[PDB]
Amino acid sequence: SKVFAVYGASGCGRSLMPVANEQLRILEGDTDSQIVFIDDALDDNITVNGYTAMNYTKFKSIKNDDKFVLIAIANSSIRQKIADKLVKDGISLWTVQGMTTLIMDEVSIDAGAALSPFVTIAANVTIGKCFHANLYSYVEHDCIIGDYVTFAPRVSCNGNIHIHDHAYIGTGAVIKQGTPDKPLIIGKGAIVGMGAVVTKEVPAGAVVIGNPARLLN
Amino acid sequence: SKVFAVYGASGCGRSLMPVANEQLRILEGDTDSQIVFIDDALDDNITVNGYTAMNYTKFKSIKNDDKFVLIAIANSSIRQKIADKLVKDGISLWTVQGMTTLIMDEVSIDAGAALSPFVTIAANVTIGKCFHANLYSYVEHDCIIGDYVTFAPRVSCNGNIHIHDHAYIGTGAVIKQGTPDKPLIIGKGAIVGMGAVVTKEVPAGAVVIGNPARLLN
Amino acid sequence: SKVFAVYGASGCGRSLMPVANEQLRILEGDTDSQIVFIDDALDDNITVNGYTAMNYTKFKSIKNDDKFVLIAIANSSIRQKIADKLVKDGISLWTVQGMTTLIMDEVSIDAGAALSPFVTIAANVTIGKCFHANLYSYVEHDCIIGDYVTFAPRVSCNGNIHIHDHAYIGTGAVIKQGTPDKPLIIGKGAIVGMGAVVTKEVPAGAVVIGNPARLLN
Ligand SMILES: CC(=O)SCCNC(=O)CCNC(=O)[C@H](O)C(C)(C)COP(=O)(O)OP(=O)(O)OC[C@H]1O[C@@H](n2cnc3c(N)ncnc32)[C@H](O)[C@@H]1OP(=O)(O)O
Ligand SMILES: CC(=O)SCCNC(=O)CCNC(=O)[C@H](O)C(C)(C)COP(=O)(O)OP(=O)(O)OC[C@H]1O[C@@H](n2cnc3c(N)ncnc32)[C@H](O)[C@@H]1OP(=O)(O)O
Ligand SMILES: CC(=O)SCCNC(=O)CCNC(=O)[C@H](O)C(C)(C)COP(=O)(O)OP(=O)(O)OC[C@H]1O[C@@H](n2cnc3c(N)ncnc32)[C@H](O)[C@@H]1OP(=O)(O)O
Ligand SMILES: O=c1ccn([C@@H]2O[C@H](COP(=O)(O)OP(=O)(O)O)[C@@H](O)[C@H]2O)c(=O)[nH]1
Ligand SMILES: O=c1ccn([C@@H]2O[C@H](COP(=O)(O)OP(=O)(O)O)[C@@H](O)[C@H]2O)c(=O)[nH]1
Ligand SMILES: O=c1ccn([C@@H]2O[C@H](COP(=O)(O)OP(=O)(O)O)[C@@H](O)[C@H]2O)c(=O)[nH]1
Ligand SMILES: [Cl-]
């Protein structure tokens, strides 16, 4: 027996629950296991879009040794804190992908990724902990994505790009390919704004916007 | 018995007819009913891409009580005029979606929408009359789309956005999320240009272009 | 009997090999024929992502009358040189598309196209020799694409656009529709930069960037 959950019942979680259902019902062929929302805003259980939603205290109390959780919270510092709590409590992080999520050859993705519909992870890609690839995003050949990286929808991450931990890439941003000799680096905790056209390395902690991408003033 | 049509045999209709065929042949499992084009430019019937195409006078004359029409005319003032004519004539508006159109939980869409391939309508979205969602567009969580709204291809409509009646959103435009306390409003009859990066409310009747979006001068 | 290959085992080829496998194993229903990489950087054969990879001398030496090659080299002058060599050697150019590639009515595509996943080729489109349509690109109604044209991922090529030979369209670029009376022309060997918003004809050999697109200075 197993129990599944989506941690976060706000906009991120509500648009991931259908994906978690494709993962569980179709890709794992599991029509038996329950799936719920976990949300720490809750005191008493409620329902969200026809799913039971409970706080983490109540989820822990469920008498099952085999719990699997997708963290659907876009803020990556919260996501890391939750992931460390879940692993410490003996709960498994659970990667979810949609029926239209495309994974190519020699891809490595750490447990707990949220891979939305129409996402492509292309050849020879390595991805770290609890990656969020929102709708239509791609990661192309030979990229290395670090831990707790977050893509908004429709991110174009071209080949030979290294995105360091906790970076955020905004809606529709486009990133120029690197080369094998010089991968294009998005630094730790950088924020690439929606619609940014990134042609050069982004420093750690920088916020860049515009076409072409410049530091936000 | 039933008869189906795509109203408009120009570029919009010709790229929607295959979608109307996925809707009818696969999603409704209907291999019997005829589907035609209606176009008021026609005097004598012609064929368009192997489909009979006729004017509305001839379509009305068809002796069938059960007619279903998708309006494939991008101009929303024409679309409203046609929709009101069809309903007055006792003809049903017909929503079409592709095999790759993704609809999530608790979505409401008024009859007569044209939902193209690779479109996502995410959680808890409400959409009004004869919506056009062209190829690759998405509407994310908790959006409210009004009547006769038109998306070009690849529109990124993020969460908590309210698009009022007759707005037009151009190819590849990206719209920043609102919040539940302050939804981001695109005003009635506004035009968001192709590639616009919208970070703020757009006034009724405004035309905005650029990154970031500004009034067209 | 037949043998298949992807010519180019770098990033372009490695992200096309899974597509060539969808084309061969699923769309042609062929679980028998071998598929390999050809790459002229090789002296001795190697393996790339679990596929035999050999130089063109070794591929020619294979005793099979029935060879089919997809050229997965983005540089269109190299692609033309290879295509002419293959045809002169009596080897067939091979169009590949993914399971999620959408082709609409009355489309003509010359042999040897690389049509990636999530690509749409819409109604009444004509495409010339060895077209590259990378991930998520579309070509909308009544376009004419010439020979050895290359789209990066997520190109939005709207209706009534004529793209002349050897043009390159960069990641996420958006091109305004033409009209039947005035198709919007992208000239021979033009380069449209990633994220460019093209609202006007692009001269032959021009390099354009930005929103709106201007000559690169
Ligand atoms: C389904 C979903 O909804 S997932 C959510 C997806 N959302 C996104 O991708 C949005 C990502 N966020 C952004 O791009 C943000 O705008 C940021 C991070 C770049 C800036 O955020 P803030 O610092 O809060 O910026 P704020 O909104 O106050 O605007 C700052 C200024 O920069 C401009 N600006 C903000 N974002 C951008 C952008 N992406 N491109 C160009 N200009 C921008 C604003 O218009 C404003 O201009 P002003 O000085 O003329 O008023
Ligand atoms: C399958 C299909 O084809 S569906 C059709 C999809 N099509 C689209 O999404 C296009 C949507 N339309 C647009 O973006 C239009 O360009 C509009 C509505 C913003 C402006 O239209 P018009 O007022 O007719 O603008 P026009 O083409 O005359 O150009 C006005 C000026 O603004 C510039 N411009 C026009 N559109 C844009 C844009 N989206 N972004 C930046 N600049 C623009 C033009 O280059 C021109 O500049 P100039 O003064 O240097 O000559
Ligand atoms: C899976 C894959 O990876 S497929 C590969 C997909 N890749 C792409 O689509 C990238 C297409 N290429 C481009 O857009 C290129 O940047 C080109 C062709 C426009 C310019 O290339 P180059 O001439 O080598 O430009 P370079 O990178 O030296 O930059 C020139 C200047 O223009 C700026 N720039 C470059 N490209 C762009 C762009 N697309 N938009 C705006 N500005 C740009 C650069 O930041 C640089 O600015 P600086 O003068 O401030 O330093
Ligand atoms: O420690 C936490 C932090 C946040 N949340 C929930 O995560 C959801 C997501 O919150 P937010 O709107 O910040 O993020 P989003 O849905 O956009 O990622 C909210 O319902 C929070 O109550 C939680 O359950 N535990
Ligand atoms: O009252 C109308 C108005 C327009 N059209 C047809 O709708 C099609 C679409 O016209 P247009 O090119 O303006 O729009 P699009 O295909 O881009 O939406 C044309 O063939 C028109 O003849 C029609 O049949 N009746
Ligand atoms: O005549 C040629 C030219 C190039 N290549 C190979 O094509 C691949 C693609 O090279 P490049 O990185 O220039 O292009 P991409 O993968 O981006 O198209 C490389 O492995 C080259 O060795 C080849 O086999 N024969
Ligand atoms: Cl897309």
Numbering used by the authors:
A (entry chain AAA), B (entry chain AAA), C (entry chain AAA): 2 to 218
Please give sentences taken from the publication describing this entry.
The crystals utilized for the investigation belonged to the space group R3 with one subunit in the asymmetric unit. The N-acetyltransferases belonging to the left-handed β-helix superfamily are known to function as trimers, and thus the local threefold rotational axis of Pcryo_0637 packed along a crystallographic triad. The N-terminal domain, characterized by a five-stranded mixed β-sheet surrounded by three α-helices, provides a binding platform for the UDP molecule. The C-terminal domain displays a classical left-handed β-helix motif with six complete turns. As can be seen, the acetyl-CoA ligand adopts an extended conformation, which allows the placement of the acetyl group into the active site region that is located at the interface of the two domains. The acetyl-CoA moieties are wedged between the subunits of the trimer. There is one cis-peptide bond between Asn 212 and Pro 213.
Utilizing the published genome sequence of the organism, we hypothesized that the genes 0612, 0638, and 0637 encode for a 4,6-dehydratase, an aminotransferase, and an N-acetyltransferase, respectively, which would be required for the biosynthesis of one of the diacetamido-sugars, 2,4-diacetamido-2,4,6-trideoxy-d-glucose, starting from UDP-N-acetylglucosamine. In this report we present functional and structural data that demonstrate the proteins encoded by the 0638 and 0637 genes do indeed correspond to an aminotransferase (hereafter referred to as Pcryo_0638) and an N-acetyltransferase (Pcryo_0637). The data presented herein confirm the hypothesized functions of these enzymes and provide new insight into an unusual sugar biosynthetic pathway in Gram-negative bacteria.
